[PDB]
Scaffold this active site. Sequence first.
Site, PDB file in Angstrom:
ATOM      1  N   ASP A   1      -8.985   2.764  -2.499  1.00 59.62           N
ATOM      2  CA  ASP A   1      -7.940   3.488  -1.798  1.00 59.62           C
ATOM      3  C   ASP A   1      -8.200   4.958  -1.985  1.00 59.62           C
ATOM      4  O   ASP A   1      -8.501   5.370  -3.106  1.00 59.62           O
ATOM      5  CB  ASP A   1      -6.576   3.090  -2.383  1.00 59.62           C
ATOM      6  CG  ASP A   1      -5.416   3.483  -1.489  1.00 59.62           C
ATOM      7  OD1 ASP A   1      -5.482   4.527  -0.798  1.00 59.62           O
ATOM      8  OD2 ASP A   1      -4.426   2.744  -1.493  1.00 59.62           O
TER       9      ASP A   1
ATOM     10  N   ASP B   1      -7.147  10.878  -7.621  1.00 55.76           N
ATOM     11  CA  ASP B   1      -6.157   9.797  -7.895  1.00 55.76           C
ATOM     12  C   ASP B   1      -6.869   8.565  -8.478  1.00 55.76           C
ATOM     13  O   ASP B   1      -6.717   7.451  -7.992  1.00 55.76           O
ATOM     14  CB  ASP B   1      -5.373   9.460  -6.601  1.00 55.76           C
ATOM     15  CG  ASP B   1      -4.130   8.581  -6.832  1.00 55.76           C
ATOM     16  OD1 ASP B   1      -3.721   8.352  -7.987  1.00 55.76           O
ATOM     17  OD2 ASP B   1      -3.545   8.130  -5.823  1.00 55.76           O
TER      18      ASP B   1
ATOM     19  N   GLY C   1       0.854  -1.214   0.000  1.00 52.53           N
ATOM     20  CA  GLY C   1       0.000   0.000   0.000  1.00 52.53           C
ATOM     21  C   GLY C   1       0.872   1.240   0.000  1.00 52.53           C
ATOM     22  O   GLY C   1       2.082   1.156   0.146  1.00 52.53           O
TER      23      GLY C   1
ATOM     24  N   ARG D   1      -4.514   1.147 -10.369  1.00 53.03           N
ATOM     25  CA  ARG D   1      -3.799   0.778  -9.133  1.00 53.03           C
ATOM     26  C   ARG D   1      -4.623   0.937  -7.846  1.00 53.03           C
ATOM     27  O   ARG D   1      -4.322   0.295  -6.828  1.00 53.03           O
ATOM     28  CB  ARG D   1      -2.481   1.597  -8.991  1.00 53.03           C
ATOM     29  CG  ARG D   1      -2.688   3.082  -8.796  1.00 53.03           C
ATOM     30  CD  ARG D   1      -1.430   3.895  -8.407  1.00 53.03           C
ATOM     31  NE  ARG D   1      -1.762   5.307  -8.659  1.00 53.03           N
ATOM     32  CZ  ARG D   1      -1.665   5.880  -9.858  1.00 53.03           C
ATOM     33  NH1 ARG D   1      -1.196   5.196 -10.896  1.00 53.03           N
ATOM     34  NH2 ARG D   1      -2.026   7.137 -10.038  1.00 53.03           N
ATOM     35  N   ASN D   2      -5.658   1.763  -7.897  1.00 56.43           N
ATOM     36  CA  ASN D   2      -6.512   2.033  -6.745  1.00 56.43           C
ATOM     37  C   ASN D   2      -7.853   1.315  -6.802  1.00 56.43           C
ATOM     38  O   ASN D   2      -8.790   1.665  -6.078  1.00 56.43           O
ATOM     39  CB  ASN D   2      -6.698   3.544  -6.654  1.00 56.43           C
ATOM     40  CG  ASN D   2      -5.410   4.227  -6.288  1.00 56.43           C
ATOM     41  OD1 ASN D   2      -4.578   3.639  -5.602  1.00 56.43           O
ATOM     42  ND2 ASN D   2      -5.213   5.445  -6.775  1.00 56.43           N
TER      43      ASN D   2
HETATM   44  C1  LIG Z   1      -7.985  -1.535   1.068  1.00 54.26           C
HETATM   45  C2  LIG Z   1      -8.114  -2.876   0.802  1.00 54.26           C
HETATM   46  N1  LIG Z   1      -9.262  -3.505   1.118  1.00 54.26           N
HETATM   47  N2  LIG Z   1      -9.458  -4.617   0.885  1.00 54.26           N
HETATM   48  C3  LIG Z   1      -8.533  -5.402   0.305  1.00 54.26           C
HETATM   49  O1  LIG Z   1      -8.793  -6.569   0.080  1.00 54.26           O
HETATM   50  N3  LIG Z   1      -7.272  -4.886  -0.073  1.00 54.26           N
HETATM   51  C4  LIG Z   1      -7.048  -3.534   0.178  1.00 54.26           C
HETATM   52  N4  LIG Z   1      -5.946  -2.749  -0.088  1.00 54.26           N
HETATM   53  C5  LIG Z   1      -4.893  -3.130  -0.842  1.00 54.26           C
HETATM   54  C6  LIG Z   1      -3.927  -2.157  -1.140  1.00 54.26           C
HETATM   55  C7  LIG Z   1      -2.813  -2.502  -1.902  1.00 54.26           C
HETATM   56  C8  LIG Z   1      -2.648  -3.819  -2.356  1.00 54.26           C
HETATM   57  C9  LIG Z   1      -3.602  -4.797  -2.065  1.00 54.26           C
HETATM   58  C10 LIG Z   1      -3.532  -6.141  -2.508  1.00 54.26           C
HETATM   59  F1  LIG Z   1      -3.455  -6.995  -1.438  1.00 54.26           F
HETATM   60  F2  LIG Z   1      -2.488  -6.353  -3.342  1.00 54.26           F
HETATM   61  F3  LIG Z   1      -4.677  -6.431  -3.179  1.00 54.26           F
HETATM   62  C11 LIG Z   1      -4.706  -4.433  -1.311  1.00 54.26           C
END
Ligand SMILES: Cc1nnc(=O)[nH]c1Nc1cccc(C(F)(F)F)c1
Length: 255
Positions: A150, A132, A17, A136-137
Amino acid sequence: YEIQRERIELGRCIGEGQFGDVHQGIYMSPENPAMAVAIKTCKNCTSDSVREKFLQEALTMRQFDHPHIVKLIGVITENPVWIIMELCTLGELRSFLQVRKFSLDLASLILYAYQLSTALAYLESKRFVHRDIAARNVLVSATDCVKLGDFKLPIKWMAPESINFRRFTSASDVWMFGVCMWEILMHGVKPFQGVKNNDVIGRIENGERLPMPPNCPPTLYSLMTKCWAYDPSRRPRFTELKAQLSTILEEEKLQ
Ligand SMILES: Cc1nnc(=O)[nH]c1Nc1cccc(C(F)(F)F)c1
């Protein structure tokens, strides 16, 4: 929204993240003795500056209730600070698209664009500017369900007025959404590969735009191009994008 750390069993790292690694885990709650969750972590959360910015995301996400926006479950505000979120079990959208490139039909890619448009129309209805919007988000909850996930600048996604003047508006979000649609239809390839961030604005000002993805419907590419009008006041709103994407999706499913 405060959750006792003893109620969380931290599992495997699922991804990276902005503030630190994200893990899957289990929340042993009164309402559900084994709820699967995502846990966002924050390196340097002992810095007040960083922690404030990290936890601001949770505050933001708490304001929204929409089928295509990820939900906040709670927070742990003692060091190490964690945000507990809804788990989207298929992970980040870019990775998903790249891995499943030759297993995803066009109808699914358009569906993903449409679902994101519904989320963003909702945010528009609340006069919230995201700033944003990018693949990626976005997270993947199921093969038929994506969610906005995100809350250094992402120059290759930004509207010209955002790069030039640091202005972000609902209209700049639509430009970014145009780029995100391109990304989806490109199976998670980034825009402007091989181009330096500094040369992006020159190309935009010279009238250049991201090209039509292979196998992209002409109605859909036209919609993208409308998102990339130089003058922000000529860009569609999300209500119009959503309606047009619904028709495009249905035309594709009839095929
Ligand atoms: C915010 C969130 N909520 N539920 C999720 O299941 N994943 C989240 N964030 C997130 C952020 C970056 C990368 C990755 C991943 F694990 F690669 F998917 C997940």
